[PDB]
Amino acid sequence: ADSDINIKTGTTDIGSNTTVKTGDLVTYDKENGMHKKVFYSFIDDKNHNKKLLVIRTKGTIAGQYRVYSEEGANKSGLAWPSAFKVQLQLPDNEVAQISDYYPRNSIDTKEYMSTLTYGFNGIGANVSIGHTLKYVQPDFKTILESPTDKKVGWKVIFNNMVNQNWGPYDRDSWNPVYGNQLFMKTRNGSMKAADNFLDPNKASSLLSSGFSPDFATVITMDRKASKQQTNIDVIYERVRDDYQLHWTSTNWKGTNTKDKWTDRSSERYKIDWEKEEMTN
Amino acid sequence: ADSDINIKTGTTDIGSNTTVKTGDLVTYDKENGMHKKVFYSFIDDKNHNKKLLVIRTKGTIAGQYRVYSEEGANKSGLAWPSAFKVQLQLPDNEVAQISDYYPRNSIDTKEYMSTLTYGFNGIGANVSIGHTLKYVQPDFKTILESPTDKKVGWKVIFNNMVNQNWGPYDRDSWNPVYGNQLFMKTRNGSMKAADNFLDPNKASSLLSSGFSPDFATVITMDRKASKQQTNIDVIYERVRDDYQLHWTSTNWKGTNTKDKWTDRSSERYKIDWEKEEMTN
Amino acid sequence: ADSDINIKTGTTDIGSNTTVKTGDLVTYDKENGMHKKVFYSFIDDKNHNKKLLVIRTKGTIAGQYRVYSEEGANKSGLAWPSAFKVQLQLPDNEVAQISDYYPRNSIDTKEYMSTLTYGFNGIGANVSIGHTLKYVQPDFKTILESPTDKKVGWKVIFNNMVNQNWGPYDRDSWNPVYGNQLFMKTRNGSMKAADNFLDPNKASSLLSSGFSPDFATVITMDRKASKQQTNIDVIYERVRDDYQLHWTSTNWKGTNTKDKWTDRSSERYKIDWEKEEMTN
Amino acid sequence: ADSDINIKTGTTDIGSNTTVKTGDLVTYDKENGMHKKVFYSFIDDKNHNKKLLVIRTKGTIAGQYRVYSEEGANKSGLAWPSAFKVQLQLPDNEVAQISDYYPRNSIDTKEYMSTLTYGFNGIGANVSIGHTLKYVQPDFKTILESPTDKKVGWKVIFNNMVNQNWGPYDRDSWNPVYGNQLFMKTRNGSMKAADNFLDPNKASSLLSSGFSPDFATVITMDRKASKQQTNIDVIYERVRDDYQLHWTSTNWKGTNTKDKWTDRSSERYKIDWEKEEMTN
Amino acid sequence: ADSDINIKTGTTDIGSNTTVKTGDLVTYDKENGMHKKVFYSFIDDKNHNKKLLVIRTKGTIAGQYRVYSEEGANKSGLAWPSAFKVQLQLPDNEVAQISDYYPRNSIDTKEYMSTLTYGFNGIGANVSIGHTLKYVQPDFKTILESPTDKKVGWKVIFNNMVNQNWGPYDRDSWNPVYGNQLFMKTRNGSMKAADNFLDPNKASSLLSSGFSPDFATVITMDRKASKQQTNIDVIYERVRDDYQLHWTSTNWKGTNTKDKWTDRSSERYKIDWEKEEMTN
Amino acid sequence: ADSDINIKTGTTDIGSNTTVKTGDLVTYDKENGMHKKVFYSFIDDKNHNKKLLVIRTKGTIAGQYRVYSEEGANKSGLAWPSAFKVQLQLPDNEVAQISDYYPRNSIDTKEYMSTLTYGFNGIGANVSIGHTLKYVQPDFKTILESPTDKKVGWKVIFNNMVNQNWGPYDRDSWNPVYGNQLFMKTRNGSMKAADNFLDPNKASSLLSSGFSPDFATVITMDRKASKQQTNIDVIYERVRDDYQLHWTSTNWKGTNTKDKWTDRSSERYKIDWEKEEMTN
Amino acid sequence: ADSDINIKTGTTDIGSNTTVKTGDLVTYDKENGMHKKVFYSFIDDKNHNKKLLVIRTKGTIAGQYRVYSEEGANKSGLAWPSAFKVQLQLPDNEVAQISDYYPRNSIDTKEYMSTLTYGFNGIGANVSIGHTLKYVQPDFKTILESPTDKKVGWKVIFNNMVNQNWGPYDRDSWNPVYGNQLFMKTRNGSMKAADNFLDPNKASSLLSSGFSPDFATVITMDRKASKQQTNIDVIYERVRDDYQLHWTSTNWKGTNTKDKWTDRSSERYKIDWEKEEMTN
DSSP: OGGGGTBOTTSSOBOTTOOEEEOOEEEEETTTTEEEEEOEEEEOOSSSSSEEEEEEOOOOBOOOOBOOOOOOSSEEOOEEEEEEEEEEEOOTTOOOEEEEEESOOOOOOOEEEEEEEEEEOOOOOOEEEEEEEEEEEESEEEEEOOOOSSEEEEEEEEOEEEETTEEEEETTOOOTTTBOOTTOSOSSOOSOTTTOSOOTTTSOHHHHHOBOOOOEEEEEEOTTOSOOEEEEEEEEEEEEEEEEEEEOSSSEEEEEEEEEEEEEOOEEEEEETTTTEEOO | OTGGGTBOTTTTOBOTTOOOOEEEEEEEETTTTEEEEEEEEOOOOSSSSSEEEEEEOOBOBOOOOEEEEOOOSSEEEEEEEEEEEEEEEOOTTOOOEEEEESSOOOOOEEEEEOOEEEEEOOOOOOBEEEEEEEEEOOSEEOOBOOOBTTEEEEEEEEOOBOOTTSSOBOTTOOOTTTBOOTTOSOSSOOSOTTTOSOOTTTSOHHHHTOBOOOOEEEEEEOTTOSOOOEEEEEEOOEEEEEEEEEEOSSSEEEEEEEEEEEEOOOEEEEEETTTTEEEO | OGGGGTBOTTSSOBOSSOOEEEOOEEEEETTTTEEEEEEEEEEOOSSSSSBOOEEEOOEEEOOOOBOOOEETTTEEOOEEEEEEEEEEEOOTTOOOEEEEOSSOOOOOOOEEEEEEEEEBOOOOOEEEEEEEEEEEEESEEEEEOOOOSSEEEEEEEEOOOOSTTOOOOOTTOOOTTTBOOTTOSOSSOOSOTTTOSOOTTTSOHHHHHOBOOOOEEEEEBOTTOSOOOEEOOOEEEEEEEEEEEEEOSSSEEEEEEEEEEEEEEEOOOEEETTTTEEEO | OGGGGTBOTTSSOBOTTOOOEEOOOEEEETTTTEEEEOOEEEEOOSSSSEEEEEEEOOEEEOOOOBOOOBOTTSEEOOEEEEEEEEEEEOOTTSOOEEEEEESOOOOOEEEEEEEEEEEEEOOOOEEEEEEEEEEEOOSEEEEEEOOOSSEEEEEEEEOOEEETTEEEEOTTOOOTTTBOOTTBSOSSOOSOGGGOBOOTTTSOHHHHHOBOOOOEEEEEEETTOSSOEEEEEEEEEEEEEEEEEEEOSSSEEEEEEEEEEEEEEEEEEEEETTTTEEEO | OOGGGTBOTTSSOBOTTOOEEEOOEEEEETTTTEEEEEEEEEEOOSSSSSBEEEEEOOBOBOOOOBOOOBOOTTEEOOEEEEEEEEEEEOOTTOOOEEEEEESOOOOOOOEEEEEEEEOBOOOOOOEEOOEEEEEEEESEEEEEEOOOSSEEEEEEEEOOEESTTSOEEOTTOOOTTTBOOTTOSOSSOOSOTTTOSOOTTTSOHHHHTOBOOOOEEEEEBOSSOSOOEEEEEEEOOEEEEEOOEEEOSSSEEEOOBSSOOEEOOOEEEEEETTTTEEEO | OGGGGTBOTTTTOBOTTOOOEEOOEEEEETTTTEEEEEEEEEEOOTTSSSEEEEEEOOOOBOOOOBOOOEETTTEEOOEEEEEEEEEEEOOTTOOOEEEEESSOOOOOEEEEEEEEEEEEOOOOOOEEEEEEEEEEEESEEEEEOOOOSSOEEEEEEEOOEEETTEEEEOTTOOOTTTBOOTTOSOTTOOSOTTTOSOOTTTSOHHHHHOBOOOOEEEEEEOTTOSOOEEEEEEEOOEEEEEEEEEEOSSSEEEEEEEEEEEEOOEEEEEEETTTTEEEO | OTTTTTBOTTTTOBOTTSOEEEEEEEEEETTTTEEEEEEEEEEOOSSSSSEEEEEEOOBOEEOOOBOOOOBTTTBBOOEEEEEEEEEEEOOTTOOOEEEEOSOOOOOOEEEEEEEEEEEEOOOOEEEEEEEEEEEEOOSEEEEEOOOOSSOEEEEEEEOOOBSTTSOBOOTTOOOTTTBOOTTOSOSSOSSOTTTOSOOTTTSOHHHHTEEOOOOEEEEEEOTTOSOOEEEEEEEEEEEEEEEEEEEOSSSEEEEEESSOOEEEEEEEEEEETTTTEEOO
16 A cells, blocks of 8 residues: 555556557357456556566356266266356467456454363263354355466365255265265255255355456566567366266265366467457 | 556547447337336447447346236246346348457356364363355346347346245245245235235336346447348347246145247347448 | 446446436325426437436335224224335326336345265264255345336335334234234233334334335436426325234234225426426 | 346435535523533435425433432432434425435344254153244334324433343333332331432443434425425424332332423424425 | 534535634643643634634643551551543633533443243252343543533542452442451551551553543624623642551451542633733 | 544645655665665645645564574573564754644444343243453554654554464463463473464464564654754654473473563664655 | 744654655575665755765565475475564664664554443333454564664564454464464365465455565765765565474464575665766
8 A cells, every 4th residue: 555655545556648449359268168268458557667468368258067977866876166267368478477466365364262161060060162263165166276477276175065044065075874964955865866956046156156356467578679479378177077876775875076177268468569459 | 457567548439539420219019018128329430440339238027926826825926027027139141240348258156164162161062063055136137138249138137036035945945834925925825815925115126127138239340341231130028937836735835837838029120330420 | 337348438328518407396195195396307418319207206105004993992903004105106198208217117136055964973864955045135125016108106015013022023923822923022921902013213214204105206208309398296105004913811802904094295396398397 | 126127326316516504402401400402404406307405303301310209218219211212393384395304113033943852862762842032122212103194203212221130121120029129229128218229320321421422314395385485493302200119118119100200391493495494 | 413404514614714713821830840831723604603713721640659658567648630620711701601511421321131941850940040240330420511611621529449359349338347448458467557558650641640620611692792802711620549558466447538638730821812812 | 533523635634736755765774684674755845834744664674583592402592572662763863843644543332232031941941140351362463652743753562363273371370280371382392492382483483484564653743843843853762571491290380481582773864844855 | 843833834844855866676586586776866955964865675575375285195395484673784884774674563553442331121120231342353464673773674464364354373373283274265164285385365455465675774885975876775685484294184284484495586776966966
């Protein structure tokens, strides 16, 4: 905060009195079902050392949460998204450099509560001691892959979910008899195996309705660069696990395998710094 | 935001120093009772790559929470809204594309609190470990259908609901003796079955009064397209369920059927980019 | 909201660079005791599709909370406002339409808490699982009746009220021995029936002091309409109830009859779009 | 509020590009100790169809919390401010009308919580059901008395108070042994009665240090009125209760009598709309 | 506040397009040790009825918390600030009046929570009807004492204090065996009586460090007045107490005497409205 | 709040339409490790009464938390910063004065809650009364020493600290078995005496990494003074304590000797009001 | 802030009406994998005493969390980032001085609570006393190393961590049988030693993905300096640790080594105050 260092607010900011040539590009990948969008703004400031270009990656990635296997009334499958990833990279040959990005990793806190109690009866003298720890855990965690000079990537992993108002079930949770109960409509059920799956409405929205990222990255050019034409690549992804239920003659049992499938988009864009346009 | 990435706030924004032409096309579907409004804008910033068009989707969908069946004093049925939906789409042959949309899927969080307590009842000894989980359950969930270019839609599904201050009930809730008690006024009642239903005032406002969507979508078209004219369709689907009450012998019984009826009200609007006006 | 789509704040809004002819109309209905006021503004934008007219229906509706009947010292009555309502409609033959009707309906929420604990005495064991549900109950809840193209109306109805720090005591609460105790000052009292009623100060303010509404509605008129003159109604209402106490020789009993009386006051205004003035 | 209808913020407000002639009028009623302050402002908008005059009713009403008389060492009295009022009447002959006023009645609220816990012991399986209800209780309630065309008034009443950090006593509380203990310093006291009252510092500030009003009443007058002059009357007043306590030879007993003394301070102001100034 | 009456925010305010003088009359009273400052501001608005003058009485009053007397290890004294005060007065013959003042008395609030729980064993069934009531209480209370036309005064009384986390103690707290133990370091102490006092650091800051007023007043004088000179007086009195502590041969006993000493300054200032300057 | 008296916000502030000549002076005291800094600003508003100068002693003071002496494994010492101080002083004969200072003593509040519970078995009707009191207590508590006319000084002391999640300890804490366990690693560890100390990271940051003050004072000097030169003195004194642990027979014993060493670093500045530069 | 002192907000700030030369330098270190950049502004306010320069330290330090060693299934190591540190120092020969730095050490707080209850049975009575304190402890705590005239540096250190929801573990935690369980997935399992480690996703984001500094620094120069060229060194760091799991033939045992590897990346930048550019 500039105001903390006695500097007038906004003095250190950039972009004053300088025109910006914004833009927009929309693409839909029918095969993978991820509507991709890239909102770019070309900021050049005569005061600033080098040109700027902020590249939003709004888009959206479909959940793709559906039962894919119908072996019978004894066992069935299910494929759900376990990680949405979008990463931008530049060719190693190019001279453009990634300067900033957002969001970024943040520290997480916890609340600690100690206790100590005395008691007198009548002639009892009971004593009690207790410690309670509280923290907030989201269903999906947004992570920023290690950003290097030429590429930055984000992830949205599946932390855990609450099923039928029962304790959160992690992706690797296991039970001695029932097995992993991540998506199990009924434990001691009698319907068809395909029917016995948690309704997509009850689950988190991201699983079935998809995830809509909003990530910002800014790249710069030496203002005296001999070449003013750099290509950039944006890659979307979706890692889908495999959840299967089978009947053990007494109760349903569920098993999960991690990173069963994966699909990418890999769109390539062409940046023209001289004319301040990015079309592809 | 831009301030966090050192970019002055509003630098990468659109619509500055450009005239915008708006409108408030409105319509009412008397048959389905869906007063639908469309408030559009035609921001045409010269710096931007493509033309813009922001289409608000204000209006309302009537709840239609009424008792329709009067088979007798022993049985009766009720019809209530289970999901309000509103959608936009463009013909495939058109070149305009859907760029953004404000209401979007968001991640949910839970507060997990552990515990551990041991005391001595001085000879004596005790130990206790506990886990607790907290989260908010909205009555209706505003989830966004998987969006694609030339088609975007929203839904408002029915989550669990609380009646008579007792435990929350949902569409699939079942009780072996009483059945689904979603809208059951009394258990050991003696008055007419049709009269035995939860008062609409006690229920959620959306069921009786109705739902008023407020969703925003923005369409962009190429600045040098061959034809500056596109047609867009807007739909206001509603889905209802059938809730049945009958006298088993000593207590009431509640049965619910999912997605019984459905009302759709589609209207086609014509967009004229050259004149910057939209006609219904 | 608007800034999430990267659009400049307030760009999609209207009413900029244009003069607005505000106004005010006040009237008092001595017979029904409701001080009704109407504040209007004419927003004529050259950019906007059609003319606008924003109606604020501010005013006040007297509570009228008093004992109306006095039949000896054994039983007496009471009349209190069950629900205040204000409506607004246009003649069918008119061409003006209702566009927006803020405030609208909102989605309720609740917090679900789940617990699970263990124990070990001193050999011994113990298990306890329990869930708690919390939510907020307003005394009066405003509802937006289904608005059509020509009429929109709000209503504020009676929810439960804490009496002497006791339970909710909603309108239809019944007790086998004491009966409905909504406004019962004392259970086993010995004073006169008429004087035995909850003091208006202890009760909610709206019951005895009145409800002052603030609802906004905007009606649009085609810019090239052949006839500019239109008409409005602006109807207020107040539905009372009858609460009676009688002595059963052992304790007081209370009974309530819903919607015993209804008094409504209407006054149609004339709109003059050409003059941009509205007269009562 | 206004921005939700897509109207730019402040578009529908008034007072733009105008010269409001404010003022001030201070009076002190040493007989009743009621400081008066009638800050006003004449908002003349050419767009608005009527003149405006917002009357701020600031001031202060002294608490007047003292032992008015003592009768021996076993009887004493105390007079405390039961309720403050501020009335702003307007002669029915005049044609000016009150348009708005602030503050106004607001809807209360309360949180409701429900519990359901059942455990097992090793096995005395138990079940527990419980519900809690919480709400805020201001010491003094600012109730807006039912307004009309020519008269608007406010009042501040005594909700209840906590005495010695034990019990929220009120005017209606009664205990068969000790009686009303609203301002009883000690139960089994042995001190003189005249000095057995709760210290004014421990009590609420408004009881002894006074209440400072803050109210607004905008009154509008027709612009083509025959005479541009309307006198107005503004009334302050407080209602005092006599709190008697005496010794029953075993313990102190206290009784409270409601509305014992009432003192009204009335002032008349002449308004000159043409001159835009009102004189004392 | 002002925007709720549909009046544009800041319209009714005062002080626009008018120049205002200021000053920092500052004095120090070495005998009483209270840094005295008076920041005045002269406002002469052509639209306003009168001429304003805002006198901010910010300053500082030393705590003066020390052991005043020492008469052997058997007993010792202590003097601490019981209450701070500050007030402004005008001569009766003057024509200036106090317009407004700040801060002012405020209404307290409390949270009241009810409860009701059932139970079943195995047989045995229990019940519970417990209550609860919580509120926030500052140790020092700032209450505006009744202001007359020529006089306004504030005070900061001592409400109560927490000693060694052993519950709140006030000036009237009494214990049969230990007596008033407000500032008692140890109960069964054995060191010197003077040494057995609560460390000033552990106590509240105001007791030993001082209090910094931030009060404000406004004075108005009719512009067409024969005499444009007025004299105003300001007082900064502090009220002390005695907390003599003595040993009863078994444990320390603390006794407190209320309002032992008092000291004040009473500086006089001269106001020159014509020159818009205030002379020390 | 200046807006609560109807005065327009910022009217009474000083600094409009004037030029302020700010500055900065940085100096580091290698002997005491205190990076002191002052940031001044000369404000001379012609509408004001006296020249102004605000001195912000930002600076920074090291922690100096290390074991000063060790004597075998039998015992060892430790020196930690007990309190940080910074003060500004003026010559006794000087004509400038201290007017204001931002950080000032503030009143502290504490919550309070009273519980009353009834019960009924089968029958054993029990009762329970409870008092709960909670408050927030920082580790280091800033205090403003009594400010006189010439010198104003702040102070930061050691309130208490939480060690190994155990009950908070303070300088005066004593335990008959272990003693003052403030900076104690293990109660009966077998490590070396010097090694058995709380890790600086586990302790508060201020103890080891220093304290960076931010205090503001404003100095006003008459504009007609014969001499326009003033001298200032700024001190950054810091007080350390001596903490020693001792092995008696089996367990470690800790003792604290408060106010052992004090480090002062005073520097004299010269102010030139005429040239508006403070240099030294 | 300045508002409290009656100084208009922003009056004492700097950087007004003066152009600031801005820039950005970005570099990546393949060996240590820490993407580092510095964002600088050359503020040259003519009113200010000295030329000013604000240096950011935005970037990222890779987590580097992987199993470095694999020695059969008996045991295997793991290296994780113990603390990320970034420094910034000037040569002792230079004359530029470090003025300020935004992130600084802050004082923490605790929420202490006290309890006291009474009980009565039937006939026996009981008493209880309780103390509880609450505080928030982040996983990573950023600490500002003691700054001086030339060198300034920050650090972020590993404070605590919750493993599998089973209490917080720190580097100093020890268990007599299991040992340090900081990153031990299963207490006893048949998997390989390398396989048995806490999944990086379950761990904190900083450990696996990395830490992104956002620190700020300010540097001043005498405006009359003989030379206008200053070299500055920017140093990043990452202190590693060694975590190893053994097998005692019954359960896994974990040992942690503190500060095993430290890899630091140093960069030297040259500043040209005349040209207002920091080359590289």
